[PDB]
A = this chain, B = another copy of it.
Amino acid sequence: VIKPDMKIKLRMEGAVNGHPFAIEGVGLGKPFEGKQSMDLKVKEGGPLPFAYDILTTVFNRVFAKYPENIVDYFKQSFPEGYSWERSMNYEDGGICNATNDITLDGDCYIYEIRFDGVNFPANGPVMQKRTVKWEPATEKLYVRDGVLKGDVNTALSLEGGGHYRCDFKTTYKAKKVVQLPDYHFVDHHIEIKSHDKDYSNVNLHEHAEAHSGLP
């Protein structure tokens, strides 16, 4: 179903602090190597008045390298696909709600993303655009009443030396009945390789590998 080589197509519609925007992207990646890359383009609502880094983790766990001992819930879910729902909590009250419906058409993954952020203070690092990079993150994946859950508590490094924490809460629902994995982790590293000035064009890279902890 899934080759070592797939393509990505996505459109994200949303609003941050009530003001709408839209982004389209095309990208590519390798599911067995856990790596993906994409090019993002702002279509509506640009220039964006908020930090672009609050969107990068919304721009697909099929691009995670899974060992044999860990059940791969996302590669099993195809060709039917899966969707995910997520709440992002920033330590100063900012809230981001995001959804992604992932389907597969041949060799291309298609995303239907919806994003909504509220309560970002105007003097905060997101509205002042004082963010630099997201630190590498560890995700906890576990089953709870028949669904797969994902929790991440990371931080954004602030242009200055500071760190801006965020808590992720994800729910993963496959379109067909698949086997559910056990408690495991997925390590992430997302990186902005290139943009212009107001982020109307963004080159985004991600690297993810699943593991089973220290023991």
- B116 and A114 contact, CB distance less than 8 A: yes
Q: Mark A93-133, 1 if CB is under 8 A from B, else 0.
A: 10111110100000000000010111101110000000000
Count of identical protomers in the assembly: 4
Q: Is A212 an interface residue (CB 8 A)?
A: yes
Number of interface residues of A (CB under 8 A): 57
User: Complex Cα distance A161/B157, Å?
Assistant: 29
Q: Is A207 an interface residue (CB 8 A)?
A: yes
- A97 and B118 contact, CB distance less than 8 A: yes
User: Complex Cα distance A33/B147, Å?
Assistant: 38
- Which listed residue, B89, B153, B183, touches A151 by the CB 8 Å rule? B153
Q: Is A201 an interface residue (CB 8 A)?
A: no
Which B residues are in CB contact (< 8 Å) with A135?
140, 183, 213
Please give the residue numbers on chain A whose beta carbons come within 8 Å of chain B beta carbons, in ascending order: 15, 17-18, 83, 85-87, 89, 93, 95-99, 101, 114, 116-119, 121-123, 135-138, 140, 142-145, 147, 151, 153-155, 157, 161-163, 165, 167, 169, 171, 183, 185, 187-189, 207-209, 212-215
A-B contact pairs, 29 of them (CB 8 A): A18-B83, A18-B99, A18-B101, A18-B114, A87-B95, A87-B119, A89-B95, A95-B97, A97-B117, A114-B116, A121-B145, A122-B145, A123-B145, A136-B214, A138-B138, A138-B185, A138-B213, A140-B153, A140-B154, A140-B155, A142-B163, A143-B163, A153-B167, A187-B214, A188-B214, A189-B213, A189-B215, A207-B215, A208-B214
